[PDB]
Ligand binder design. Structure first.
Ligand SMILES: Nc1ncnc2c1ncn2[C@@H]1O[C@H](COP(=O)(O)O)[C@@H](O)[C@H]1O
Ligand SMILES: Nc1ncnc2c1ncn2[C@@H]1O[C@H](COP(=O)(O)O)[C@@H](O)[C@H]1O
Ligand SMILES: Nc1ncnc2c1ncn2[C@@H]1O[C@H](COP(=O)(O)O)[C@@H](O)[C@H]1O
Ligand SMILES: Nc1ncnc2c1ncn2[C@@H]1O[C@H](COP(=O)(O)O)[C@@H](O)[C@H]1O
Lengths: 326, 326, 321, 321
């Protein structure tokens, strides 16, 4: 719009929706936590850890995970908009104190890729928000199909910090201006290319691939249609790879394999949110046998296979799947 | 040391070397340009481009390349330490005005990976410094073998901003604390693992690989020794992939292939600097037929094949090479 | 209370007010302008001005353009008055909302060179009436819906009131958000600091002369008051709020109407100081009861702890004839 | 001149001086402390203090620890005197170098609450002699090798002299480097602003009373001087440098030795103002000629444009008997 900033944009979307402001507050809270995480990821205050004032305290990765988790939980609970939270970092669902209870359920991965931090890989934060439809709040309120998402997004802490957000009317991209302290709208209603020229998976699991994955990858490298082989990219940090898929097209895959027969990536707070973003941008996201968003979750840390991206590429993959299962 | 900051560390290394301060000034200048580039890469002032004060000006990639190039050139020339500069962004060598001429030659890539910027991939800045040994300065002073490097390094603008620097006594790592505006020493005398478990190349050129590359990659995925296959990673941004190789071990490759018979990566300002860092950290860097640092440059934008990393992995690759050439 | 950030706090107050979001958006817009201004004032990007890649007037103009743009693009405004513009700015019809904003985008900027604390001051009115015009900005201060100031001092602070007291927020530049640091601040009943430019002593009226005399030479055995005068209105007004005492820029022979501007300096700070339980007077009338005649009108200003202002007013009334 | 950044500028001056790098490292250490302090003063990380993840005394202590640590770890120092420490701090023998540094790490911090401009002040001496001790910090100001101040105002600025005039640098927080903004600054011969706390009028000596009278009521038909008093020494001293005039904290009946501290407030600013072509006096003696008796000794301070200080001194000499 003319709204420029994420704060004004979200407020205005909430006015158009005729919201009571409960979701707008939840979204403000999440975005504030994301700003705080960006600052920490970029290492503001590092000199103090290394003894600049005479005090040396040097698991850094574990600390940043705890801090990022603590930022998101405290910001969300203090919004007065939540009843249940599921975090990648916590074994059990976290039930909001009765005094601060609202309507919404949030599933999130506060710092995805933090294992990679030591090599300074792009990392990110992923979230999905549901309405508690349902008696007293419990983990069951977080076990809703991805079709029920009200809002979802991710933050990528890369060369710059970016947020992808959808509330159901397409995908909008915002970049953090650190001099201002605000996210700025840079692309409205982003759409993925119908077909790409990049494929993204860990080919070190080639020995463990099903026949479908083997066939598909072989055709990316050795096409049978006279075209140039696809380029390969795999950062190993899910948000970086998914975001590149969104902006450049192509396909990203973490399929089941012999060692991970149900996949690796987590349904509630990795795969559902990114599937929603990708579908909202005109792409496809599949387990290989059904849309990610149609999977009925059985457990809050359930794993699923994930294949997503440009619709023509995901279709070509699904073709290999059907053919090799027949 | 106790030096804590890069500024004090470099000064003190220059006092121990008994330098006149000319190289210390050159290094201060480069690091200042790197700080300025980090700020721009992270998008400080973006809101002003998008019309916050009423003024909208929205090729952004080309601009950031020009700015990064302009930062490095002006900072280096104004140091009074340089006579010749070679930049990735300029066709010809840039000869320093006589009034500002010093002793050193600098080869640099001011913003490597900038093509990827739109997907927020990690990007970096790479440099190598030589002494003009040699009549009037010309591009010939930049055509020295990598064995003649006096200092070299890279900046990685990733989840945080980091500098790897060597002046010939090993590799030291520094992280930018943005709240302070200084680089902080985080690891002194870093050494690469003797053997890793990650291989990093673009397997989309598989159709174009020589027999050696094909054999090596097949053995990473299908080992013949009872071990687990290697993991694959390839960001497609050279500094990100090289830095991960340094900190985690393994191998990174951009070999010659049918479409790029001399390689893709540039000898003077990509491959020489990273080969020097990697060798200073106890690794190996080869063209496949000789050490990168022994290649005698013929032209300032010459390409070379590059294979580098943990010594046992690079040896295993060189074995495939020798065997398949025999 | 739990809300922590100014964005959440303002939003929650709007929800409590049962607002449509129009004022909330306007406040969000102003606060974004203020963050942009703080960054420029602290000199972000200065190295680029000094040729790394090969003016007080410019910063005045930038700050003015920041505020005008953010406010117009809120869709919440119909009329703006700026210190920097001769005439009122009437918002394009497509972007029109119901609020009128009077502001000084960078107060104190003539003294930028000495790095003195400087600030941004604003007051918001609901338009009453009829096609928009200057007259819509000529409401008395009693009609203010919201007002506040940003001080760019050792840290950046905002003081804001929407009619329920004064709240103080500090910018955390690492987060890029204002954090609530004090709720419902109250000025001391009586302070121990007086603040005016005594370099105009030669031109003071008798009441002012008498009052300053009493501060330095008290007759009741109390310690004399300390003196402070930064010469930057927001810094002096803010110090008076937090420490107490009195701030004065009265009329003098050389400035017979006073110096400070009613619409976008005096009314806003008066509103804050009264919301905090202080007094704000021209020496004739409460500031907030002055009926404005012109958009750049000047008035005298005496404000602060109520007991100190009442003393001043006793001196004025006494010397009247 | 071409050097742009303070780090390059200081390094180049050390190369011109044919230094071994010891002083350069010390300056680098101090400037790093100052950047760390500016960031804390602007309240980076405040949201974490207010519970986002679930004190003026603390900032005094942090600033003090920043400076002590950076200076000790330079390997350039043998003795430090801080405003914050009773006793001199003797550097561990392993880290000892030849310089003695007297500093106020956060001057003005008692008034942090009102967000007043505040600063950091330092002076550096070469040790003369013999095992290190307090006595090594009791050199007169004439022996200063380098001195300066950081002002944390609307922007962060450093004023530095190493004996060749005064240079001014501004922090670009986007780059994290100080940028040269003025070389070899010279104070005006005569200014138009006087700066003191006239709340002590009741306790002034006759010379001070007479002088202030002349500023407000000149007898030669000139306009009276304007008054400014921030109450923060670095802000008032810096304004006097850039705009001219006079700054006074003389002895009075209540503070008979004066208030400001010789080693780490008065000597450093005197050194800067004299290097800029101004005067700095106790009213008895130039500050820089005072032979210090004790590390926390107090002295009167009058400084600024030379023509204005000489007028003050004429008033002092005149009223002596
Ligand atoms: N800021 C917003 N942006 C987009 N949709 C919104 C917003 N606020 C509310 N909505 C929609 O309105 C519904 C109810 O809002 P609420 O009353 O805030 O719970 C949400 O569940 C959304 O579907
Ligand atoms: N800051 C430094 N760190 C490491 N080595 C240095 C430094 N300064 C100088 N040297 C070494 O001393 C040589 C001459 O220094 P220069 O007189 O500064 O040209 C360099 O070419 C280096 O080999
Ligand atoms: N964010 C807010 N904080 C405090 N009061 C508000 C807020 N928003 C609205 N109000 C009150 O409700 C009125 C109507 O708001 P609006 O419907 O946005 O024009 C305003 O003029 C205020 O008096
Ligand atoms: N960075 C510098 N800037 C200006 N003068 C300096 C600098 N470094 C050293 N000097 C002068 O040379 C002397 C010796 O320096 P040093 O050898 O480092 O102790 C100092 O006491 C100064 O008078």
């Amino acid at each position: 719009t003319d709204m420029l900033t994420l704060t004004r944009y979200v407020m205005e979307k909430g006015r158009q929706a005729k919201g009571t402001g409960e979701l707008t507050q939840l979204l403000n809270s999440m975005l504030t936590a994301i700003k705080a995480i960006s600052s920490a990821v970029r290492k503001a205050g590092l000199a103090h850890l290394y003894g600049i004032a005479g005090s040396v305290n040097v698991d850094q990765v574990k600390k940043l995970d705890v801090l990022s988790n603590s930022l998101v939980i405290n910001m969300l609970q203090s919004s007065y908009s939540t009843c249940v939270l599921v975090s990648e970092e916590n074994k059990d669902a976290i039930i909001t104190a009765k005094e601060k209870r609202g309507k919404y359920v949030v599933c999130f991965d506060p710092l995805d890729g933090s294992s990679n931090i030591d090599c300074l890989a792009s990392i990110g934060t992923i979230f999905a928000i549901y309405r508690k439809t349902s008696d007293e709040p419990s983990e069951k309120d977080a076990l809703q199909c991805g079709r029920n998402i009200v809002a979802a997004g991710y933050a990528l802490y890369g060369s710059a910090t970016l947020v992808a957000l959808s509330t159901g009317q397409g995908v909008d991209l915002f970049m953090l201006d650190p001099a201002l302290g605000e996210f700025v709208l840079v692309e409205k209603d982003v759409k993925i290319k119908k077909k790409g020229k990049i494929y993204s998976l860990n080919e070190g699991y080639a020995k463990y691939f099903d026949a479908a994955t083997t066939e598909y990858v072989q055709k990316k490298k050795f096409p049978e249609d006279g075209s140039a082989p696809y380029g390969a990219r795999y950062v190993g940090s899910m948000v970086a790879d998914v975001h590149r898929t969104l902006v450049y097209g192509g396909i990203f895959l973490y399929p089941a394999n012999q060692k991970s027969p149900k996949g690796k990536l987590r349904l509630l707070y990795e795969c559902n949110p990114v599937a929603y973003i990708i579908e909202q941008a005109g792409g496809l996201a599949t387990t290989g046998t059904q849309p990610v968003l149609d999977v009925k979750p059985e457990a809050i840390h359930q794993r699923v296979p994930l294949i997503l991206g440009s619709p023509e590429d995901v279709q070509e993959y699904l073709t290999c799947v059907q053919k090799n299962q027949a």
